[PDB]
Scaffold this active site. Structure first.
Site, short mmCIF file in Angstrom:
data_model
loop_
_atom_site.label_atom_id
_atom_site.label_comp_id
_atom_site.label_asym_id
_atom_site.label_seq_id
_atom_site.Cartn_x
_atom_site.Cartn_y
_atom_site.Cartn_z
CG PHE A 27 -7.12 -33.00 -63.35
CD1 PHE A 27 -7.07 -32.41 -64.57
CD2 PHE A 27 -6.57 -32.35 -62.29
CE1 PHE A 27 -6.45 -31.21 -64.75
CE2 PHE A 27 -5.94 -31.15 -62.46
CZ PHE A 27 -5.89 -30.57 -63.69
CG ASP A 141 -5.51 -26.50 -62.42
OD1 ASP A 141 -5.79 -25.35 -62.09
OD2 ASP A 141 -6.39 -27.34 -62.54
NE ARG A 145 -9.17 -26.57 -59.24
CZ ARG A 145 -8.99 -27.75 -59.81
NH1 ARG A 145 -9.44 -28.84 -59.21
NH2 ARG A 145 -8.39 -27.85 -60.98
CG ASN A 146 -5.56 -28.66 -57.73
OD1 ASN A 146 -6.42 -29.44 -57.39
ND2 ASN A 146 -5.47 -28.18 -58.95
CG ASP A 159 -4.73 -33.01 -58.52
OD1 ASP A 159 -4.82 -34.13 -58.96
OD2 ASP A 159 -5.34 -32.62 -57.55
#
Ligand SMILES: */C=C/C(=O)N1CCC[C@@H](n2nc(-c3ccc(OCc4nccn4C)c(Cl)c3)c3c(N)ncnc32)C1
Ligand SMILES: [Cl-]
Ligand SMILES: [Cl-]
Length: 277
Positions: A27, A141, A145-146, A159
């Protein structure tokens, strides 16, 4: 239904600076920097994400809706927007988390992570996702990692909603998303299962060695990620439920909070880790 008195801060360019790049993702690019609110005599360390250009036709219409959601968040396990700047580019400002993303954290600390922390992270992520579902927001998503580490005992999701706004992570996607581009809270649940797998394997890459182009084919043949070595069948069974072809047969986030919460009351019964006595 109580009045929502969150603040939406529309930031002038002079009200923040980007100091050092932290990394980049699907993003945009993230920097550490400072927020310097006009006429307030303080400077606050923050993270700033400069969004990539949208491939989506209506994204400029939707950016504010996305800001509203991020600004509005009121859950301990979902990250919130401090401010937004819209000029040539869109920049999102939020609290700076010194401990970084959960994916890096499990990789970096693998030798030192025990059952209680792992189960608690599952509960917390489920809680945040449940909150997003309550607000009728589909993440699209969810991945390790998020998730950001506020403290090792407190993690928060990031995110949500950007994938839609900006217009893929095939290895985290529900089959219906891959085949039909259908995204729902239940597709999020599939991603939640993959995310849990990432945690339980201390950050292994899912389907490592299978090209993304083949994933839809293997899933259709019934292949799924394997039982992690630390996992009892009780934990793994939950992950597998997340990956049912029929979306309505997958668990609800609210159910996930309950099941993980029960296991977190006796973590050594449900995850078997060396030195975790
Ligand atoms: C494993 C994650 C990873 O590799 N990175 C790259 C380095 C920077 C890391 N990082 N990213 C943010 C961050 C995430 C999302 C952000 O905005 C979107 C959003 N989601 C919820 C609310 N908002 C505003 C922003 Cl602005 C930054 C980091 C933060 N915030 N703190 C520390 N590291 C971050 C991810
Ligand atoms: Cl918090
Ligand atoms: Cl936050």
């Amino acid at each position: 239904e109580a009045p929502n008195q969150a603040l939406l801060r529309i930031l002038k360019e002079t009200e923040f600076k980007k100091i050092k790049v932290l990394g980049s993702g699907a993003f945009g690019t993230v920097y550490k920097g400072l927020w310097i609110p006009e006429g307030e005599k303080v400077k606050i360390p923050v993270a700033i994400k400069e969004l990539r250009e949208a491939t989506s036709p209506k994204a400029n219409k939707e950016i504010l809706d996305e800001a509203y959601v991020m600004a509005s968040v009121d859950n301990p396990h979902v990250c919130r927007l401090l401010g937004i700047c819209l000029t040539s580019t869109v920049q999102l400002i939020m609290q700076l988390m010194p401990f970084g993303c959960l994916l890096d954290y499990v990789r970096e600390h693998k030798d030192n992570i025990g059952s209680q922390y792992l189960l608690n992270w599952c509960v917390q992520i489920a809680k945040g996702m449940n909150y997003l579902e309550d607000r009728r927001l589909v993440h699209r998503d969810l991945a390790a990692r998020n998730v950001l580490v506020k403290t090792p005992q407190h993690v928060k999701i990031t995110d949500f909603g950007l994938a839609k706004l900006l217009g893929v992570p095939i290895k985290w996607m529900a089959l219906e998303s891959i085949l039909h581009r259908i995204y729902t809270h239940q597709s999020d649940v599939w991603s939640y299962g993959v995310t849990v797998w990432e945690l339980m394997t201390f950050g292994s890459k899912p389907y490592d060695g299978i090209p993304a182009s083949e994933i839809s084919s293997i899933l259709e043949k019934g292949e799924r990620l394997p039982q992690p070595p630390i996992c009892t069948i009780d934990v793994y069974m939950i992950m597998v439920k997340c990956w049912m072809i029929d979306a309505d047969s997958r668990p609800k986030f609210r159910e996930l909070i309950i099941e993980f919460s029960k296991m977190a009351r006796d973590p050594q019964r449900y995850l078997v880790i060396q030195g975790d006595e």
